[PDB]
C-alpha cells in the first residue's frame, strides 16, 4: 500500500503547518468502468475490497387507442367539342411554385 | 459542377432478361442479376444528408444453353484469417502461464455464393406459369383468413383476382 | 505501490417482436389496338432538381401506376408491353436536408 | 424557408379508345386492400390467453 | 445456465410477391366492362345511404351518373 | 456492501477534521432507467430494496 | 486452423 506522510510545499512559509502528502501512489485509469467506481472519495490504503449487488427496474405504458375513417367523392364533369377540335376544362385552383433554371 | 439536383438510386433485387430462341428451343440470352442491401458501416453523414453504402452481389453474363437446362453463372468461396499478438520479451513464451503477459487478436470467416439460372420455352398453360398462378391463389386465401368475417377489408379481398 | 482495481457490468435483454403485412393491388385498364393508356392512383411529392449548383422544383409520382400498349391479331392474339409499379413512401430512408 | 410547397393526392387517367355512339366505357378501376400488424411481447407471459 | 453469460441477437423474415396480367378483347357490352359499370352503381348507392334524407349533398349525389 | 470510512484528502491541512470516505463502491449506469431511479440521495448500504 | 473449424472446410474446397 501507499504511505501517508507530512510534507511542506515548495515556496510555502516555514511557519505554516504541514499538509498531507504521500509516497509512491497509483491511481489507475478505468477504461469502461470510468464513472462507475468512485476514486475521489476512496481511502487509498484500501479498507473494504468488494462491492457486489444489482440495481434495476422496469417501466410500462398503457395503450387503448381506436380510430376509424371514411371518405366519399364523386366528380361528374361534362364537356362539348366538335369533331377534329379540342376542349379543355379546369375546376380548381393554382398554387405558386419556384422553378428557375 | 459545383462543390442542386436530387437523384434516386435503386437497391434490392434486380433482374434483366433478353432472350432469343432457335428452332430447337436453344436459348441465347443476356442476364443481369443483382442483390444489394444498405450497409450502415460504410455510410457517411455529409451535413444531414446521409449517404448510404451498399453490399452488392452482381453478375452480368452472356450465355447460351438448351431448353430447360440449369447453368451456373457465378460462384465464390472466400476464407480469410488474421492474427495479431503483442507480448513481453521472455515471459510471453511460457506455456499456459504466458497468457498473463501476452494479448491475442484473432479473426476468421468465410463467404459462399452461387448464382444459377434456368430458361424454359413455355406457354400460359405450362407448368412454370401454373405454379405461380396457384401460388397467388394461396396468397389471397391466406390474407382472407386473417380478417374478421364482417370486416369491410375482407369484402375487398374477395373482389380481387377475378 | 502494487495492487489492482477492477470490476464488471452487465445488461439484461428480453426483447421479442413480430410483424406481418399484406397487400393486393388490382388495377384495370382499357385501350384500343395501336393506342396507349396510362393510369396513376397515388400522389406527388416535391423534389428539388436544378441544373448545376450545390432553384427548380420537380414533382415525383408514387402509388400504383400502369402503362399499356396493346396490339391485336386476326385470331385475337395480343402483343403488348406492360409496366406495373407499386411504390410507397418509406420513413426509414428519408433524409432531412 | 417560408415558401410552403404542397403535396398532392392524384387520380389520373389518359386513355385512347374508340366506341359506338352513346356507349359507356370504363377506362380505369382499382381495388386496393392493405393490412399491417406489429406485436411486442414478453417472452412467456405474452402468450397466456386473455 | 449459459444464457446468464451470453447474449443473442436473432432476425428472420421472408417476402412473397406475384405480378400477373390478363388481356381480353372486349366491347362496351362485354362482361369485363359491365362488372365495373355495376360496381360504380353500387358505389353511388352506398354513398347515398350514409346521408340524411333532407341533405343537399344527397340531392347532388342523385344528379350524378345519369 | 460498501464500507464507510474516514479519510483525509491529499494536500489538506493536518489539523482539519476528516471527511466521509468509502471503500470499493459501484454506482452502476442505468440505461433506460436513467432519471427514474434516484442515485444522488440513495444511502449506499441499501436499506429498503423494493 | 483447428480440425473442426468451418473455415478449414472452405479452404479444402479451393484450388480444385
UniProtKB/TrEMBL annotation, chain C:
**Domain of life according to the entry:** Bacteria
Stated name of the protein: Type II and III secretion system protein
Query: What range of the full-length protein does this chain span?
Result: 252 to 352 of 502
* Family to which the UniProt record says this protein belongs: Belongs to the bacterial secretin family.
Amino acid at each position: 500500500g501507499p504511505r501517508n506522510v507530512a510534507t511542506i510545499p515548495l515556496g510555502q512559509d516555514l511557519t505554516q503547518p504541514p499538509v498531507a502528502g504521500t509516497g509512491v501512489r497509483v491511481t489507475p485509469p478505468l477504461g469502461s468502468l470510468n464513472g462507475a467506481i468512485d476514486l475521489a472519495n476512496l481511502a487509498r490504503p484500501i479498507a473494504g475490497t468488494t462491492n457486489f449487488g444489482i440495481i434495476t427496474g422496469v417501466l410500462s405504458t398503457i395503450n387503448f387507442a381506436l380510430s376509424n375513417g371514411d371518405a366519399y367523392l364523386i366528380a361528374n364533369p361534362q364537356l362539348s367539342a366538335r369533331s377534329g377540335g379540342r376542349t379543355d376544362f379546369l375546376a380548381g385552383g393554382q398554387v405558386p411554385i419556384l422553378q428557375a433554371l | 459542377a459545383a462543390g442542386q439536383n436530387v437523384t434516386y438510386k435503386d437497391y434490392g433485387i434486380k433482374l434483366e432478361f433478353e432472350p432469343r430462341v432457335d428452332d430447337d428451343n436453344n436459348v441465347s440470352m443476356r442476364v443481369l442479376a443483382d442483390v444489394s442491401d444498405i450497409d450502415p458501416a460504410t455510410s457517411v453523414s455529409l451535413n444531414g444528408f446521409t449517404v448510404p453504402g451498399f453490399i452488392t452481389r452482381r453478375s452480368n453474363a452472356e450465355i447460351n444453353v438448351g431448353d430447360g437446362q440449369t447453368m451456373v453463372i457465378s460462384g465464390l468461396v472466400n476464407p480469410k484469417t488474421a492474427k495479431n499478438v503483442s507480448k513481453l520479451p521472455w515471459l510471453g513464451d511460457i506455456p499456459i502461464l504466458g497468457n498473463l503477459f501476452k494479448s491475442t487478436n484473432f479473426q476468421s470467416g468465410n463467404t459462399d455464393l452461387v448464382i444459377l439460372v434456368t430458361p424454359r420455352v413455355v406457354s400460359a398453360a405450362s407448368l412454370e406459369n401454373i405454379r405461380q398462378v396457384s401460388q397467388a391463389v394461396e396468397m389471397k386465401d391466406e390474407y382472407r383468413n386473417t380478417l374478421p368475417k364482417g370486416s369491410t377489408t375482407r369484402d375487398a379481398v374477395d373482389r380481387t383476382l377475378g | 505501490n502494487f495492487g489492482i482495481i477492477t470490476g464488471v457490468l452487465s445488461t439484461i435483454n428480453f426483447a421479442l417482436s413480430n410483424g406481418d403485412a399484406y397487400l393486393i393491388a388490382n388495377p384495370q385498364l382499357s385501350a384500343r389496338s395501336g393506342g396507349r393508356t396510362d393510369f396513376l392512383a397515388g400522389g406527388q411529392v416535391p423534389i428539388l432538381q436544378a441544373l448545376a449548383a450545390g432553384q427548380n422544383v420537380t414533382y415525383k409520382d408514387y402509388g400504383i401506376k400502369l402503362e399499356f400498349e396493346p396490339r391485336v391479331d386476326d385470331d385475337n392474339n395480343v402483343s403488348m408491353r406492360v409496366l406495373a409499379d407499386v411504390s410507397d413512401i418509406d420513413p426509414a430512408t428519408s433524409v432531412s436536408l
